[PDB]
Design a protein around this ligand. Structure first.
Ligand SMILES: *[C@@H]1O[C@H](CO)[C@@H](O[C@@H]2O[C@H](CO)[C@@H](O[C@@H]3O[C@H](CO[C@H]4O[C@H](CO)[C@@H](O)[C@H](O)[C@@H]4O)[C@@H](O)[C@H](O[C@H]4O[C@H](CO)[C@@H](O)[C@H](O)[C@@H]4O)[C@@H]3O)[C@H](O)[C@H]2NC(C)=O)[C@H](O)[C@H]1NC(C)=O
Lengths: 53, 104
């Protein structure tokens, strides 16, 4: 409990939140890069409703 | 404000056909019930969830397009009375009855 000190904070000009932001983005993309790409899923789809009855 | 045939006759022990035609046949199923002389109606058909409705009591029903069908079972011996139709409207508000059939 730092005594006698009165340091000024700023939560909107703080860069720990921006470091947080770019870390998650790079962390998300690293967890999808080695997996199955679904490029063949782009075909004409013929679809219907379900049990309006 | 629906249509129902008042008088159809068919051979006993054979299959029969009942129709009820209308526009709001998309909002709430069909129903029919049967009216014996001087007695209260009884559930001909019901709905417990989705397709499992007609099934195996006998009867069975089909819904083509504008009009629906009550394909009844094979035996038709003595089970004779007057049949109506219930159903609700597209806005769920109120219910219309449009008469029905008396088979012999
Ligand atoms: C899967 O489920 C969706 C949602 O239920 C269905 O989409 C509905 O489809 C029906 C039927 O195609 C549409 O209802 C039609 O409305 C026509 C008039 O529409 C105008 O006015 C209404 C309001 O009164 C507006 O909502 C609409 O935007 C329009 O301005 C009627 O004319 C239709 O009836 C008959 O005539 C027409 C014209 O000749 C024919 O094309 C029809 O086949 C029919 O013979 C009909 O009532 C409805 O608007 C759609 N959405 C809604 C809000 O439910 C899909 O159709 C369905 N697909 C399958 C395969 O079931």
């Amino acid at each position: 409990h730092l005594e006698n000190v009165t340091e000024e904070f700023n939560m909107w000009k703080n860069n720990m939140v921006e470091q947080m932001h770019t870390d998650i983005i790079s962390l998300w993309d690293q967890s999808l890069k080695p997996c199955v790409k679904l490029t063949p899923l782009c075909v004409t789809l013929q679809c219907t409703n379900v049990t309006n009855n | 404000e629906l249509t129902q045939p008042p008088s159809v006759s068919v051979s006993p022990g054979q299959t029969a056909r009942i129709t009820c035609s209308g526009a709001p046949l998309t909002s709430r199923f069909t129903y029919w019930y049967r009216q014996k002389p001087g007695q209260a109606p009884v559930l001909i058909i019901s709905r417990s969830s989705q397709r499992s409705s007609g099934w195996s009591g006998r009867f069975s029903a089909s819904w083509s397009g504008t009009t629906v069908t009550l394909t009844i079972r094979g035996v038709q011996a003595d089970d004779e009375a007057d049949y109506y139709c219930q159903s609700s409207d597209t806005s769920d508000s109120y219910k219309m009855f449009g008469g029905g059939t008396k088979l012999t």
